[PDB]
Amino acid sequence: SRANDAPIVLLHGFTGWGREEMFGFKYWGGVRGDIEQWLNDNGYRTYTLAVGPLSSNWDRACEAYAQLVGGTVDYGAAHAAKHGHARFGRTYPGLLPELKRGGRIHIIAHSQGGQTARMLVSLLENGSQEEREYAKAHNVSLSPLFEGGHHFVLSVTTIATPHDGTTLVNMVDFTDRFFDFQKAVLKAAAVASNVPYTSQVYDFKLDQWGLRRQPGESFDQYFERLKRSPVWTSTDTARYDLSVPGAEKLNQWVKASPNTYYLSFATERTYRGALTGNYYPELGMNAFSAVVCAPFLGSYRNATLGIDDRWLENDGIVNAFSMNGPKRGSTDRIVPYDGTIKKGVWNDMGTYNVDHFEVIGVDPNPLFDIRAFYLRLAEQLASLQPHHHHHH
Ligand SMILES: [Ca+2]
Numbered sequence: 001s002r003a004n005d006a007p008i009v010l011l012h013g014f015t016g017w018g019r020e021e022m023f024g025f026k027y028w029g030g031v032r033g034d035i036e037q038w039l040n041d042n043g044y045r046t047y048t049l050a051v052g053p054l055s056s057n058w059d060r061a062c063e064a065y066a067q068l069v070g071g072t073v074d075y076g077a078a079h080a081a082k083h084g085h086a087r088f089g090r091t092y093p094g095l096l097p098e099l100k101r102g103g104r105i106h107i108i109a110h111s112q113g114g115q116t117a118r119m120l121v122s123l124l125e126n127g128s129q130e131e132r133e134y135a136k137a138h139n140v141s142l143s144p145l146f147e148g149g150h151h152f153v154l155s156v157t158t159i160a161t162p163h164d165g166t167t168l169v170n171m172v173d174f175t176d177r178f179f180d181f182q183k184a185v186l187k188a189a190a191v192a193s194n195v196p197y198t199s200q201v202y203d204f205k206l207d208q209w210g211l212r213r214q215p216g217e218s219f220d221q222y223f224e225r226l227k228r229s230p231v232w233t234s235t236d237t238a239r240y241d242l243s244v245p246g247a248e249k250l251n252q253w254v255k256a257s258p259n260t261y262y263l264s265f266a267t268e269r270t271y272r273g274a275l276t277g278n279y280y281p282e283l284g285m286n287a288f289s290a291v292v293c294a295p296f297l298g299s300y301r302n303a304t305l306g307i308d309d310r311w312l313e314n315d316g317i318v319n320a321f322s323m324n325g326p327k328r329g330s331t332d333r334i335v336p337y338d339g340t341i342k343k344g345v346w347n348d349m350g351t352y353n354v355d356h357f358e359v360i361g362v363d364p365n366p367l368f369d370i371r372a373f374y375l376r377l378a379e380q381l382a383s384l385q386p387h388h389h390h391h392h
């Protein structure tokens with residue numbers, strides 16, 4: 001039945017928060033409950049990571065590592081010099097100090113979470129040649145995360161991840177539209193955007209950039225400030241990594257480890273129009289996605305960028321064609337699931353009829369058994385064999 005005892009770790013996208021944030025409301029579960037809890041009750045040790053939702057995958061990856069092993073976030077000296085932010089972040093206690101002693105984990109990531117998870121794997125296993133070269137060139141200390149040689153991750157599961165980016169950013173008004181997604185998760189959780197709460201509520205963890213919501217500042221007001229900040233204007237952001245070109249770049253160095261299993265899940269909440277060839281939002285898609293983005297994703301074409309008709313289908317925020325695994329600028333192989341979970345290859349699990357937010361329970365969908373979906377997932381992860389024997 002079960003082949004391993006690795007704990008499961010949860011990871012979010014451009015939206016996300018800690019278990020104690022959003023007054024109880026969990027990113028993993030939302031209006032449908034508590035995912036991390038359900039899995040623990042069913043006997044699968046499960047934890048949750050909270051990283052900078054608008055930060056680049058690199059920053060998140062450094063935060064994920066430190067949050068898992070414990071310590072102060074070290075973004076890398078060369079990295080910090082190149083982007084002009086702090087080298088050191090926040091300090092963590094360490095969710096799983098067992099990792100530094102031979103332990104392994106299973107990473108279930110959603111949205112942009114999937115790129116982060118890939119990146120963390122590639123850094124753990126290979127480190128950063130540039131970071132290593134800069135350490136000795138300028139005699140600065142070096143994070144273990146940049147030496148290579150770690151083997152913490154048994155598997156990586158991706159759900160609605162923009163492996164090849166999303167064409168949602170190509171919107172002319174993407175800046176304003178995008179912060180409406182943060183406003184939306186705030187409403188999902190019953191939190192207003194026009195109110196200066198004195199309690200944090202939603203920490204964007206921008207310690208490296210020196211940004212934070214201040215006194216008598218409503219999320220709306222704070223979002224206006226962010227838009228003009230490096231978090232939204234520099235390449236070292238989630239906005240860059242989310243774009244087609246940015247993903248392509250990330251795809252060029254972030255490869256699938258041969259020692260790690262990879263699982264892909266794709267989402268889709270659309271229908272094809274017979275005369276236009278466009279995709280249109282289905283009944284039950286969240287109102288923010290259905291009004292502005294869903295129509296853009298299913299009609300947006302760009303020949304020079306490589307955007308044709310296979311990119312139309314979407315989950316209201318991310319193109320479905322970009323979820324089965326990195327393709328643009330990648331050497332990673334993808335194989336359709338045939339009952340056998342191979343290692344070092346993207347095991348394409350197919351497309352599911354749920355939106356970007358229905359998969360995590362942030363948006364409701366009673367036609368979707370979210371409990372069964374994540375219980376099936378973990379049962380599958382526990383059955384993964386650490387070392388598989390070659391056979392007939
Ligand atoms: Ca819905």
Ligand SMILES: [Zn+2]
Pocket residue numbers: 056058059075079083085208236
């Ligand atoms: Zn950075």
